[PDB]
Design a protein around this ligand. Structure first.
Ligand SMILES: COC(=O)C[C@](O)(CCCC(C)(C)O)C(=O)O[C@@H]1C(OC)=C[C@]23CCCN2CCc2cc4c(cc2[C@H]13)OCO4
Ligand SMILES: [Mg+2]
Ligand SMILES: [Mg+2]
Ligand SMILES: [Mg+2]
Ligand SMILES: [Mg+2]
Ligand SMILES: [Mg+2]
Ligand SMILES: [Mg+2]
Ligand SMILES: [Mg+2]
Ligand SMILES: [Mg+2]
Ligand SMILES: [Mg+2]
Ligand SMILES: [Mg+2]
Ligand SMILES: [Mg+2]
Ligand SMILES: [Mg+2]
Ligand SMILES: [Mg+2]
Ligand SMILES: [Mg+2]
Ligand SMILES: [Mg+2]
Ligand SMILES: [Mg+2]
Lengths: 175, 139, 190, 252, 109, 201
RNA sequence: AGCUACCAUCUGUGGGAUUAUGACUGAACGCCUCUAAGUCAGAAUCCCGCCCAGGCGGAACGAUACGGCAGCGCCGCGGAGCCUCGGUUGGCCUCGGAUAGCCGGUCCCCCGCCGGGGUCCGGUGCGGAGUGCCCUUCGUCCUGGGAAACGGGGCGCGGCCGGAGAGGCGGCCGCCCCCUCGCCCGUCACGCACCGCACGUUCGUGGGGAACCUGGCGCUAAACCAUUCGUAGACGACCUGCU
RNA sequence: CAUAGCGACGUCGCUUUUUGAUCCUUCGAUGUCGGCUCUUCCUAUCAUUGUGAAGCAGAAUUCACCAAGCGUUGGAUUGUU
RNA sequence: GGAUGAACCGAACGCCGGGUUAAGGCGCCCGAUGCCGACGCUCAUCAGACCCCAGAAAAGGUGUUGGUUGAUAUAGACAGCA
């Protein structure tokens, strides 16, 4: 599974009806995939791991994107997950600040890849939930709980380094 | 050392990106890199925005963080950011750059003639002042 | 993790003033003037009031390593204040088993000569750092008095003297001779 | 494999270009470090190897077996007729190194000195420095010379004097004088320039430069041996008598 | 009276690492360092002007030493304002790093 | 461009500036670099000194005279660095390599002219402030370059004369501003024209 | 004599950054701590000096070709022309520097009337801005209003100063001769207007080589071979001498 | 008294200076041991310069680090390595 | 294309023009990121830099970054001093 800007998907599926149970139970999952096809594939993988289901043995009845109910509000996300490291499987709890749940999941993917070399295929996201500022446990997130937050931009790096490529004046980084 | 800060109600100028050349007000701070950004009167709907495309100004509004569009818009209109900004040297420098860029060939010709005559008069006055200042002889 | 802001404020006594030229700290006290710049550390220095003279050291968006620099700067500033107000006097005691250590304090205390360290014919010539005055204590038989304004210079001169009398090719645990710093103290005891 | 026993290398790698010297005189390549504190003094001189002999003296070295005893030590005779300083060169420091700024030659160059400029003195018209010396008489020429002196004063760092020997005082066949730049040390640039100017056309006896019982350095070109084999050129080991294609060689 | 053409540099031929397509060439128009700014110069006539030993006929003038290899810029190249030019004859390799004029002849503005 | 491009080496990184120069000389452009001793190299001084000593160790064992010619002057070092980014074994590379001139300090042909600065190679913007860096002048001085002191003295004299020229130019600019103040009733007609089209804010 | 031997005799050198290590201040971690920032000492190692050679690398200076028509140098952008090599298509004539700060101006202290300091006032997404500045070419003729008129032009002469790191450059006076022309807005018409077409527009009197004429100002030499030497040497080369 | 100096039981590496395994090159030929001579290089450092530790009192010795600049010899026996 | 390589990756071939790509790349060599690329980690006095592939293991680090589990704490922790 590659990445991009992930999207939440409410995936609903069930087994094929059989002459043992005419109405098999439905199962609903939240899957974060770059596209709905990958969402369906991951849904089949997860239901095969948890229940005794196969993609051929069952069917998917609904697959739609889950839009963020308040993308204009800053909120704290608590994420539970497990991943296979180079020497086994471990459980983690991470915290992020983002407007969208899917963006928070993408941030979690990028952070895990950056810190633990965890490729996307090795990561099992098991719980995503918005949390209050009081329930946050990571100080890197808790330090943004300031009603009077204030900080400058200390050392601004020049980004337009090639327009011009040659000039007479040395740039100023103080602003 | 620092005179300009990132805080709620601080007015920032958009350097590049989709909203380049617009004034916005910071609403909340996100992960050291992004911020809740709202221009209610500069036609910039609420959205996230990276700090790298921001250039801070000296106008600071006074509204609670994560307030709705109404209070931010009232804080913008009261003590009008637009009129005060337009009087600043920054905004008029931007305006001068924009009108210089859109200057046509006829305007270039007229500007060249006017600058010719102006520079000649200024240089004549400079020569007069040099010769007036060259008559110095005192022990 | 980058901490948003880490700051510590150092109070300045009324008899001494501090002037900042960017990150160059000019401290002028009754005992003299000490100047030290911190251009190698990217922090913010500011003077707070005209009443009590609070000095604050600010570091914005610092990782774990550079956060340690704030208190280092604060301690250096306090050391400079202590030096310009009270000064730094280091007392070194010369110890020996058989051969007494003859110490000659040459011109203005800037040069120290050791004659009979372990009885060898060599003479040790150690020049003090500028602004540091060395002297022989008049209250003790074997004591060297080093006085100066800057703690680094005085302690560096003391270390030079201590390392100058170093036993070689011998079990230094048994041969304990040399000049060693007894205490690090102040002048004027105020 | 390693050689079975270690042995010090034959010869020195500090003299690898084992070639005939490109010069017959022997150049200095490093003058003593100058300081303005010392008085003005020359740093070099020219001599001719007259011969060798031995002397008898008493040694005053305490703690030695030969203390207050008589010794016989070989000495070398170097005939040194006084040098004649005939010019001044001023050098200026550059990041590319020292370079010749300006050269001033004195009037009335000695006849033996003028012989150096000619490969064939017999067939020459003896025209060397004839038009140059005329600028020591006209007022414009002396103004030019003073301007050159002032330029050397305000710009040059080290100055050196051109001095030549005196063949007519020596029993050699050669009448061609030996030219040399000699560094003038010990003072400010103006002081040494004036001091050199007061010694133009003059004789500098060897006593004014070197003194009694002081130790100096000798620069020269050794005796030529022609084409020599490794046995004499490097003092390598001679191969045994049984060797077929030669025993005065290097085996490997 | 005026320069009347834009300065450009024959950077080189269209090429891979070990293959060289000499039938088309890459040019560097001075002051154009982005791909979006290359639209104005597309389709413009470009000429390579040099001198030689023998006199050649000159349209509207006396014969002289000036020789021209005509061409026109086809499409943008890269993202740093590079452009591609197809000439009537393949450019001699001695012209690499020399002046190429953009003649503004096909005006679309 | 057609003119000679003068670049000041102070505060510039070695690799970035060398790559930019090598790209410039390939375009048939004349490039002159002054004050090459002011070039900074990323990484602490000891590591770069070890790198240059390792370069010194690489020599032809059979005949060091034919071996790699280790140049010790900072300008020569930068010249060799640029030569590493060019096909200097070809005629095109040599022709490009002849368009580049490098100097320690600023020579009299160039001290009376303005000097360009490349933003993409400056140490201030291309290096994190917490890092350490190595001066090319100091590194050359401790490895075999011989003329650091005379270069510093000549740069000191050039700075003195440049300060005199700067004070003269400040006097001229002050007098020009004064002249602008003296005459404006005969200037405002053109001033409004210039202010209308963006020039002269 | 010459060559020659620890088989005789003489001579063999200075400095820098630093490794290991030992320390200082000092947090990180209200204690400590050689380390994180910043500092000190430090060696048969390393590098440089001394020494040896001297780049398809440079410097300064010398003298630069006859007594006959004979060569050469400079001055004239002097002329008429040839051959050859092609690039290019306005200039910018300069602070130092810092980036957790800069830049400008001004009132008081101190150094030769100009600078360094302490105040105060400004600018800072640099506008006293290289995203910048200067100049800008159609030309002439009536023809007014402004700018100026203490103004520009002199390949015009003479004088002076500054520039030495590669000064190959720049600046300033005196005399003489010009026009009141050039700069902006106006009036007035004219020019081959070559009938749609490209290499046009500059550096430029470009670089280099032979040659003619036209004038002025100046000069009259070396190298090599041969020979001689032996401080040299396979031969060359090298050190010498020759009314 | 584990670790001054060693290290059983186990266990992980490095070298191509030994000897093995293979037969990829060489069978219209790459002269095969050893010795002599000579040059350079490596360090897993014997000594020397500078250090740290010891069951380092001194001496002597051992262990360890920076370290390959300098040196590591004369002989009886054996063709010898 | 992998610098280079009989086997690897892509892709198999009459001679050309235009266009688009694969594998792989886009500081300069050397065509292309002269994107105002995004997020984080990392200082190495033998750093690191891309299948095959051309160099490394066990064991450690109070260097730094995350994460798990547990414990103490205004009924005053922890660390220093007594
Ligand atoms: C019986 O002993 C030999 O084989 C040595 C010799 O005969 C030496 C002859 C050399 C001449 C000049 C006569 O060709 C010979 O043919 O050398 C061969 C030789 O011919 C040149 C080939 C070898 C193969 C590769 C190198 N050459 C190296 C010498 C050698 C040494 C040997 C060997 C074979 C080779 C060969 O077996 C055991 O030791
Ligand atoms: Mg050996
Ligand atoms: Mg035989
Ligand atoms: Mg001997
Ligand atoms: Mg303390
Ligand atoms: Mg250390
Ligand atoms: Mg030191
Ligand atoms: Mg054979
Ligand atoms: Mg053979
Ligand atoms: Mg080792
Ligand atoms: Mg002992
Ligand atoms: Mg050696
Ligand atoms: Mg291939
Ligand atoms: Mg490869
Ligand atoms: Mg094709
Ligand atoms: Mg490549
Ligand atoms: Mg390219």
């Amino acid at each position: 599974k590659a990445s991009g800007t992930l999207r939440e998907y409410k995936v609903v599926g069930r087994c094929l009806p059989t002459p043992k149970c005419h109405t098999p139970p439905l199962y609903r999952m939240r899957i974060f995939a770059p596209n709905h096809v990958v969402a369906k594939s991951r849904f089949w993988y997860f239901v095969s791991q948890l229940k005794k289901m196969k993609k051929s043995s069952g069917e998917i009845v609904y697959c739609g994107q889950v839009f963020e109910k308040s993308p204009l509000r800053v909120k704290n996300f608590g994420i539970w997950l497990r991943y296979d490291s180079r020497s086994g499987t471990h459980n983690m709890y991470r915290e992020y600040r983002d407007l969208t749940t899917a963006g928070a999941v993408t941030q979690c993917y990028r952070d895990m890849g950056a810190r633990h070399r965890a490729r996307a295929h090795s990561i099992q996201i098991m719980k995503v939930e918005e949390i209050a500022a009081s329930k946050c446990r990571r100080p890197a997130v808790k330090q943004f709980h300031d009603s009077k937050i204030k900080f400058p931009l200390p050392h601004r790096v020049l980004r337009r380094q090639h327009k011009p490529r040659f000039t007479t004046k040395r740039p100023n980084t103080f602003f | 050392v620092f005179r300009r800060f990132v805080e709620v109600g601080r007015v920032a100028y958009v350097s590049f990106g989709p909203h380049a050349g617009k004034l916005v007000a910071i609403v909340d701070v996100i992960d050291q890199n992004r911020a809740l950004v709202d221009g209610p009167c500069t036609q910039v709907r609420r959205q996230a925005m990276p700090f790298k495309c921001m250039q801070l100004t000296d106008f600071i509004l006074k509204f609670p963080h994560s307030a709705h569009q109404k209070y931010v818009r009232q804080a913008w209109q009261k003590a009008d950011i637009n009129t005060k900004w337009a009087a600043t040297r920054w905004a008029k420098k931007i305006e001068a750059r924009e009108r210089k860029a859109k200057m046509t060939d006829f305007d270039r010709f007229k500007v060249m003639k006017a600058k010719k005559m102006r520079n000649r008069i200024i240089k004549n006055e400079v020569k007069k002042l040099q010769k007036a200042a060259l008559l110095k002889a005192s022990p | 993790m980058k901490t948003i802001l880490s700051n510590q404020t150092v109070d300045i006594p009324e008899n001494v003033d501090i002037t900042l030229k960017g990150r160059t700290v000019i401290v002028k006290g009754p005992r003299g003037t000490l100047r030290r710049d911190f251009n190698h550390i990217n922090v913010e220095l500011s003077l707070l009031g005209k009443k009590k003279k609070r000095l604050r050291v600010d570091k914005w968006w610092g990782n774990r390593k550079e956060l340690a620099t704030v208190r280092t700067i604060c301690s250096h500033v306090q050391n400079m204040i202590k030096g310009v107000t009270l000064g730094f006097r280091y007392k070194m005691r010369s110890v020996y088993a058989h051969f007494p250590i003859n110490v000659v304090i040459q011109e203005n205390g800037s040069l120290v000569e050791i004659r009979n360290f372990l009885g060898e014919k060599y003479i040790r010539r150690v020049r003090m750092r500028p602004g540091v005055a060395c002297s022989v204590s008049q209250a003790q038989k074997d004591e060297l008095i080093l006085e100066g304004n800057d703690i680094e210079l005085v302690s560096n001169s003391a270390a030079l003297i201590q390392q100058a009398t170093t036993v070689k090719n011998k079990d230094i645990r048994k041969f304990l001779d040399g000049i060693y710093v007894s205490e690090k103290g102040t002048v004027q005891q105020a | 494999s390693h050689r079975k026993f270690s042995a010090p290398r034959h010869g020195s790698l500090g003299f690898l270009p084992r070639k005939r010297s490109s010069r017959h005189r022997g150049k200095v390549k490093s003058f003593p470090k100058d300081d303005p504190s010392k008085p003005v003094h020359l740093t070099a001189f020219l001599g001719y190897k007259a011969g060798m002999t031995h002397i008898v003296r008493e040694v005053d070295r305490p703690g030695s077996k030969v203390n207050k005893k008589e010794v016989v030590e070989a000495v070398t005779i170097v005939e040194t007729p006084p040098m004649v300083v005939v010019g001044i060169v001023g050098y200026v420091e550059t990041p590319r190194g020292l370079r010749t700024f300006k050269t001033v030659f004195a009037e009335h160059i000695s006849d033996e000195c003028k012989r150096r400029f000619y490969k064939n003195w017999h067939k020459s018209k003896k025209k060397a420095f004839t038009k140059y010396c005329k600028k020591w008489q006209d007022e414009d020429g002396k103004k030019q010379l003073e301007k050159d002196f002032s330029s050397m004063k305000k710009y040059c760092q080290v100055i050196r004097v051109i001095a030549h020997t005196q063949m007519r005082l020596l029993p050699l066949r050669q009448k061609k004088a030996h030219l040399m730049e000699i560094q003038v040390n010990g003072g400010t640039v103006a002081e040494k320039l004036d001091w050199a100017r007061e010694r133009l056309e003059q004789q500098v006896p060897v006593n004014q430069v070197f003194g009694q019982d002081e130790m100096i350095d000798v620069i020269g070109v050794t005796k030529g041996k022609g084409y020599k084999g490794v046995t004499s050129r490097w003092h390598t080991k001679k191969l045994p008598r049984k060797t077929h294609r030669g025993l005065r060689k290097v085996a490997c | 009276s005026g320069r009347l053409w834009s300065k450009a540099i024959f950077a080189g031929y269209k090429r891979g690492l070990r293959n060289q397509r000499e039938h088309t060439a890459l040019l560097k128009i001075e002051g154009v360092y982005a791909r979006d700014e290359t639209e104005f110069y597309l389709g413009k006539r470009c000429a390579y002007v040099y001198k030689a030993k023998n006199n050649t006929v000159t349209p509207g003038g006396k014969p002289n030493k000036t020789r021209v290899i005509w061409g026109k810029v086809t499409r943008a190249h890269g993202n740093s304002g590079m452009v591609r030019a197809k000439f009537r004859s393949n450019l001699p390799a001695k012209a690499i790093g020399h002046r190429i004029r953009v003649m503004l002849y096909p005006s679309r503005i | 461009e057609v003119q000679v491009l003068v670049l000041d080496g102070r505060g510039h990184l070695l690799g970035r500036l060398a790559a930019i120069v090598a790209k410039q000389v390939l375009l048939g452009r004349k490039v002159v670099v002054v004050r090459c001793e002011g070039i900074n190299i990323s990484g602490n001084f000891y590591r770069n000194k070890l790198k240059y000593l390792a370069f010194l160790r690489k020599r032809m064992n059979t005949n060091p005279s034919r071996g790699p010619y280790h140049f010790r002057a900072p300008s020569r070092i930068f010249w060799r660095t640029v030569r590493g980014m060019l096909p200097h074994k070809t005629k095109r590379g040599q022709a490009a390599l002849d368009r580049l001139k490098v100097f320690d300090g600023i020579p009299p042909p160039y001290d009376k002219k303005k000097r360009m600065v490349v933003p993409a190679a400056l140490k201030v913007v291309r290096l994190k402030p917490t890092r350490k860096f190595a001066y090319l002048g100091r590194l050359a001085h401790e490895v075999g370059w011989k003329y650091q002191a005379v270069t510093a003295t000549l740069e000191e004299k050039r700075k003195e004369k440049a300060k005199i020229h700067y004070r003269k130019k400040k006097q001229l600019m002050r007098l020009r501003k004064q002249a602008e103040k003296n005459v404006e009733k005969k200037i405002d007609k053109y001033t409004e024209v210039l202010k209308t089209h963006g020039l002269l804010v």
